[PDB]
Design a protein around this ligand. Structure first.
Ligand SMILES: NC(=O)c1ccc[n+]([C@@H]2O[C@H](COP(=O)([O-])OP(=O)(O)OC[C@H]3O[C@@H](n4cnc5c(N)ncnc54)[C@H](O)[C@@H]3O)[C@@H](O)[C@H]2O)c1
Ligand SMILES: NC(=O)c1ccc[n+]([C@@H]2O[C@H](COP(=O)([O-])OP(=O)(O)OC[C@H]3O[C@@H](n4cnc5c(N)ncnc54)[C@H](O)[C@@H]3O)[C@@H](O)[C@H]2O)c1
Lengths: 436, 435
């Protein structure tokens, strides 16, 4: 019963805690920050291993060969290296990340090696899949058909911590999501494939999410959504739309960063934000602060967007963080200024809406609400919902509860059934309501 | 250490849980609802005692004499009965209730008995006092003076459970809250005493609380704010205002019930809501579309009408038996908007001072406290009420409070340790100042 956890990010702690409970699981932890592992070693009995998986992919193979299960909590690019070691060594594996084309290229040997690899555990993906599949299957067991599926999700700060220009606090580097604002989105509505362009015009797709009168939510569609007809088996539905939730004004706040060229991949030019932004407003590069400001508003001139820039210090003398790109730096800056404090609460909000046509002809509207709040004295809501389902599927693999073999997501009741039940004991509870 | 808990309502459960932790406290629980006590006995190691305080006063003296401490979690009217047994048997006592004139009557015998009775623990009163005094004392000890105190508080549903016409769910009987909309409010602003009358016009006093861009809160003043100058020692302030927080649209929805005459203490006239509601507008009977247009007349805001049908007040449903039209409404609101077993409640609390320093500069300080209920545990209201009660109980046992007599939690000796140990339970309040 030996388990190797790759990566020691804060998503790892609620996993260690969950698997440590019975004491019959030998936990090894490996990563490239010896500090992260030292702190974790104080709270849980774990064999620590310092390793750069990218560079020492052979020491990784030797380590992998010794385990009964590998849980990859590494940045998802590295998952293929880990799956390779697991495939040659016949060791089961789980991840909390999208099964990429790269990792899917390996699907056959995974079935030839006779191992099980369960990916797309976690929050999004993960619990979203499991909630959808649960009710999509429940409809089919009664001869019903899915006509519409609208799902929205978002990890946010608890509302009392929402008073900043972005109405947001970042659980990790936003390098990935920020760039996604420049993307087009695609979804299905009333039988027609709908496409919305990203960039400056993406703010037009943003909409008010009025599920809860007490909460000020805006939503906007994800990149694709249309893929879920095949993924979930709902080819008959006329609308499929998955989206993200924020507090109102966040996207407008980002719309500014796009206008200023901050969501940009180029490299960085004693550098300060006013200098860096001077270079970005064409004027550069050592002019009076008020002159720099007159030009920022020119790309506008919306004061709310200017107010957000000043509040963060992007027009000030503060030093730009070292990074290989403007975005990389901006992300590292937003982290220094809007990370969660040790006594601040985050939030998870998830609302699904299914249109279920029954063979009798009745149209049922089913909604599922899942809201969780962080525990200051325990784990965050994001850490609970990302790390628990991963940790739960791992124990199920150990305890021998998943017979399916190969490379798979968490779509079969064999997987989502037990996880959805045992997360209740952990405070992740959802609620349902139907009407006809 | 032996402790007697009087009352087995839902506030007792987070108190039992807190006292049970060290295992060196023998808990006795007594009340008149046997089945509440049985359920608690399954979850906690407790001596169950069936007792009606009004009738078995003698049995009450016997049990108290055996304890090191009595925690009265009974309806506050009975607390004096419990105080007598404690004074006579020289046993310390704590409550979570406003210290009434009746109870202050005994204040001398409490000091003659040499015991401590700490009241006004809990949320309001309780945590309200302790947060204010914490900050006021900090200002006064560096020679500062309080110029303004604006405090807002509210127990509400967590925002995910706010989708109903009132944006509210009731933790207990709303008779108290409903009637307060008919009472006037009084406070002090910029040196001038402000008066706002209740009833229909109280909706004009309602205001937007924009502390949190993510939350849609409204606020309004309580019955009496000016009394807090004496309670906190801040006669110096030019502004005193304590108020209640709700989700936007609650007071408007309540404004409808008042327009319709539902907030009324007179008696009720096989009676149905449509039948009763016709008598309040024509009877008796008959057709729904007739009432709907007539209900609309007392308005004519249809939004307030949307709330009434949604609650079934225009329907064939039977009105509950009750001594008054109100109360009937309360019992109905309880039947239709109580908390389900998987719904989360909330506590939201913001204070704003108000502080002039001897250097002459003006400090604005805000204290935020927010708590959420736990589906697998206790509600936010239960935690914030029972924890400060249970903690002061442990402090009295463990000997950390030297004061004697009848007192609230205003002294650093009490509120200090309590506030510190509350944070350890995940209930966090944060302070922020600027100039
Ligand atoms: N399903 C979900 O909802 C969800 C949400 C967020 C993150 N995730 C997944 O969480 C995982 C970790 O989060 P992250 O992607 O932000 O990365 P991260 O930067 O937080 O790093 C995670 C851990 O891996 C370590 N690490 C990084 N590179 C390493 C290397 N070359 N060798 C050894 N250790 C290395 C890091 O030190 C860290 O301890 C990812 O796989 C991510 O896709 C899933
Ligand atoms: N400071 C605060 O924020 C706050 C908030 C809520 C409640 N409280 C206090 O909690 C206490 C109880 O709450 P509640 O009144 O809403 O519920 P409640 O009136 O039902 O009282 C709870 C318990 O008292 C028992 N009880 C009532 N009469 C009894 C009798 N004659 N003999 C034996 N047991 C009797 C009940 O059976 C019940 O178990 C009250 O004193 C209230 O002041 C304080």
């Amino acid at each position: 019963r030996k388990v190797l956890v790759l990566g020691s990010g804060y998503i790892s702690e609620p996993v260690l805690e969950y698997l440590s409970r019975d004491g019959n699981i030998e936990i090894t932890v490996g990563s490239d920050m010896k500090n992260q592992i030292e702190q974790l070693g104080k709270k849980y009995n774990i064999n620590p291993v310092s390793m750069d998986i990218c560079k020492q992919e052979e020491k990784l193979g030797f380590l992998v060969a010794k385990q009964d299960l590998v849980i990859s909590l590494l940045p998802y690019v590295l998952h293929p290296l880990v799956a390779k070691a697991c495939i040659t060594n016949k060791v089961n594996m789980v991840t909390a990340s999208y099964i990429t084309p790269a990792l899917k290229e390996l699907e056959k040997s995974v079935e030839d090696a006779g191992i099980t690899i369960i990916g797309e555990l976690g929050l999004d993906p993960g619990l979203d899949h499991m909630l959808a599949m649960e009710t999509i299957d429940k409809a089919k067991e009664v001869g019903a058909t899915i006509e519409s599926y609208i799902s929205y999700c978002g990890g946010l700060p608890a509302p009392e911590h929402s008073n900043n220009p972005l109405r947001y606090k970042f659980s990790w580097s936003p390098v990935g999501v920020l760039m996604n604002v420049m993307q087009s989105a695609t979804y299905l509505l009333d039988g027609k494939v709908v496409n919305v362009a990203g960039g400056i015009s993406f703010l037009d797709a943003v909409t008010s999410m009025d599920f809860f009168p007490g909460l000020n939510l805006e939503g906007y569609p994800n990149r694709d959504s249309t893929k879920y007809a095949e993924i979930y088996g709902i080819s008959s539905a006329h609308t499929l739309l998955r989206g993200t939730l924020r507090y109102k004004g966040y996207m407008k706040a980002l719309n500014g960063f796009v206008k200023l060229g901050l969501i940009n991949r180029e490299a960085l030019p004693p550098l300060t934000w006013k200098q860096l932004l001077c270079d970005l407003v064409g004027s550069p590069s050592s002019e009076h602060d008020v002159l720099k400001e007159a030009v920022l508003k020119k790309l506008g001139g919306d004061n709310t967007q200017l107010e957000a820039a000043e509040w963060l210090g992007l027009l000030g003398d503060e030093q730009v963080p070292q990074a290989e790109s403007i975005l990389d730096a901006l992300s590292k800056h937003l982290v220094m200024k809007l990370s969660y404090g040790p006594e601040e609460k985050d939030m998870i909000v998830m609302r699904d809406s299914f249109g279920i046509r029954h063979p009798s002809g009745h149209l049922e509207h089913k909604t599922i609400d899942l809201v969780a709040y962080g525990d200051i004295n325990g784990f965050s809501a994001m850490a609970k919902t990302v790390g628990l389902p991963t940790a739960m599927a791992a124990k199920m693999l150990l305890d021998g509860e998943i017979g399916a073999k190969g490379l798979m997501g968490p779509f079969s009741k064999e997987i989502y059934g037990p996880i959805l039940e045992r997360i209740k004991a952990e405070g992740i509870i959802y609620t349902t309501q139907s009407t006809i």
